[PDB]
From a paper:
Bovine and camel chymosin are aspartic peptidases that are used industrially in cheese production. They cleave the Phe105-Met106 bond of the milk protein κ-casein, releasing its predominantly negatively charged C-terminus, which leads to the separation of the milk into curds and whey. Despite having 85% sequence identity, camel chymosin shows a 70% higher milk-clotting activity than bovine chymosin towards bovine milk. The substrate-binding cleft and active site are located at the interface of the two domains.
Based on X-ray synchrotron-radiation data, the structure of bovine chymosin has been redetermined to 1.8 Å resolution. The structure of bovine chymosin does not differ from the three structures determined previously and can be superimposed with the earlier structures with an r.m.s.d. of 0.39 ± 0.02 Å (comparing 1733 atoms on average). In both the present structure of bovine chymosin and those determined by Gilliland et al., Strop et al., Newman et al. and Groves et al., the N-terminus is visible and forms one of the strands in an antiparallel β-sheet as in other aspartic peptidases such as porcine pepsin. The N-terminus of bovine chymosin forms one of the strands in this sheet. The engagement of residues 4–6 in the β-sheet in bovine chymosin keeps the N-terminal loop in a conformation in which it forms part of the binding cleft; in camel chymosin the same residues point towards the active site. The chloride ions in bovine chymosin and the sulfate ions in camel chymosin are located adjacent to these patches, demonstrating the impact of the positively charged patches of the structures. Previous studies of bovine chymosin have identified a positively charged patch on the N-terminal domain and a negatively charged patch on the C-terminal domain adjacent to the substrate-binding cleft; these patches were suggested to influence the interaction with κ-casein.
Residue numbers in the entry:
A (entry chain A), B (entry chain A): 1 to 323
Amino acid sequence: GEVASVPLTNYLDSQYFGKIYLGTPPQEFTVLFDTGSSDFWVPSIYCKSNACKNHQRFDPRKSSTFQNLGKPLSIHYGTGSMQGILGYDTVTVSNIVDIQQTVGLSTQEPGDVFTYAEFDGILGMAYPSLASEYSIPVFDNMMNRHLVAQDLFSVYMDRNGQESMLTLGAIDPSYYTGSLHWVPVTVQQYWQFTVDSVTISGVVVACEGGCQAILDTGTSKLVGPSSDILNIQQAIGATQNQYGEFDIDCDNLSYMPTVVFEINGKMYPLTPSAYTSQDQGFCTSGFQSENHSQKWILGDVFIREYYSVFDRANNLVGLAKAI
Amino acid sequence: GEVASVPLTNYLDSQYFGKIYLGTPPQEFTVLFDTGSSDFWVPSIYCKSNACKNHQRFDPRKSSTFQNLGKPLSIHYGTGSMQGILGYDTVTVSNIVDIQQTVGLSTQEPGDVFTYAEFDGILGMAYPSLASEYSIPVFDNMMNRHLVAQDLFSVYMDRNGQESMLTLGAIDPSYYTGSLHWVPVTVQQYWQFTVDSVTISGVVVACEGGCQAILDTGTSKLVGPSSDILNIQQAIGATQNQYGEFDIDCDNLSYMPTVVFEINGKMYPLTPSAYTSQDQGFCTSGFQSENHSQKWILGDVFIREYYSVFDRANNLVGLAKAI
Ligand SMILES: [Cl-]
Ligand SMILES: [Cl-]
Ligand SMILES: [Cl-]
Ligand SMILES: [Cl-]
Ligand SMILES: [Cl-]
Ligand SMILES: [Cl-]
Ligand SMILES: [Cl-]
Ligand SMILES: [Cl-]
Ligand SMILES: [Cl-]
Ligand SMILES: [Cl-]
Ligand SMILES: [Cl-]
Ligand SMILES: [Cl-]
Ligand SMILES: [Cl-]
Ligand SMILES: [Cl-]
Ligand SMILES: [Cl-]
């Protein structure tokens, strides 16, 4: 029954990541705390890929508490893949000591997807139904052993600065204004819920009649079905460039529409500033299309605007305007 | 992972009750399945009170699986009290076999409160925080040992007939029309939630600005704070008689107001037929005052109109219009 404050870092267009420790004595890693997945893995000495060469690698030879399970682990992240082997060791996340935790030790991380990522590994924070075979999600172990004060965690992403924070077991009202609104999880695998509509000036531009969405800290953009995202890219004045990216004129923010997500009867507006990312003298749309799905992904673009609480005890998502 | 269908019976103005079995071999009892409490008890051979004389008494001498814990149990029901001693035995509720279940064996049930009650004992179905010391709620044992298919139960009360039903582990859409609406539990002790307002023709007559309420199968009436209930007794044309009861003219139902509870943005109307009980050539108000509380109790008057699902996995109450 403890609380862990995990400061999150991000560089430019990178994901948000933070520190955990693994083994006895503790070995340090940066991980993507990822509400879009449920497995926990880090690079290991058994991985020779370029990506592993560029990241911290777990050395089980130096841990008195490591135990190999031998079971394969395979995951996808972006267009890349990781292959590894599951074992047990002790994970420490500030206050919290999570012994005998299943963890993948990578063996293969081919390609450049993981090489230039800022994090070493991924710590999934979604439901066990999303976990790979033989894998037990870290937060589930924490809950089942009553290691956390409450069975929830909170994520604050600093739109402007470096005060981002993941809190295990508590909610910090200092990171938001107004009150938290609670949204029922519809399908317990991702952190999934119903979006009622997406509007501009009261006109429905997407999600007509309702759609499913997930709240995903491990995705940067706001992802939706082709035809809906088209409506939005046109409305915000985004246009495709050679890289396939949708660019927005940074100096036009003042003239662009506010895109409002209605979730469980409450409004979650995204201003042009919010949905436009400025990674240079170039601004890009924070909206992105998917072709083989109608399920929305509310990634960091959304979370930066709305402090997010993930409540396993009640199967709710809490949203409040981020400070 | 099973389902139990427990038929519920009621006679005239009695509570609703159903059958469970206790001991090895099984001994039969009728119990009040009571979402307003969390303890489980039945009369025993060690109780000589009149009330025990008029009810089935558990004989541990005949059960090979009984174990006395010796710990006292004390409960209140209506204006009466039960004193007993906790032990373990096996409870059977149709499909479901719940071994080593804490159960109070009564020793003292003085006064007439329990004597003329139809049930032998009480099986509380609220949260563990409401349970007496050393007592483990039956449904919590069922959930913790994965004895039920889903961690919820559903209650249908037949306003007109004898088709009432308690279902452990499932929801039966045949008992309701339209769809279930889910209401968040605010305080996990009783099945408690927020009522937004109580209105007649759109005018707020009670619960101005919101109030707390519980959904309680072990209470007959709809209970609220003095001043609010006054507004309602006056509006429905109820008047006090010598017995302190509020009587309603049965032939005036057609002229009386509909009293609407707004809960989580949805309307739950109670027609004059619904809130008027006809236990003879006399009709009485289903509303009742309480003086030392502002927390409403939505008892059988409400549940008869709205099929009720109690969901422990999600800490929700589900409501739908009863058939
Ligand atoms: Cl990254
Ligand atoms: Cl799950
Ligand atoms: Cl909790
Ligand atoms: Cl907290
Ligand atoms: Cl809601
Ligand atoms: Cl939908
Ligand atoms: Cl589409
Ligand atoms: Cl703006
Ligand atoms: Cl009774
Ligand atoms: Cl509790
Ligand atoms: Cl369940
Ligand atoms: Cl069901
Ligand atoms: Cl209130
Ligand atoms: Cl009052
Ligand atoms: Cl009527």
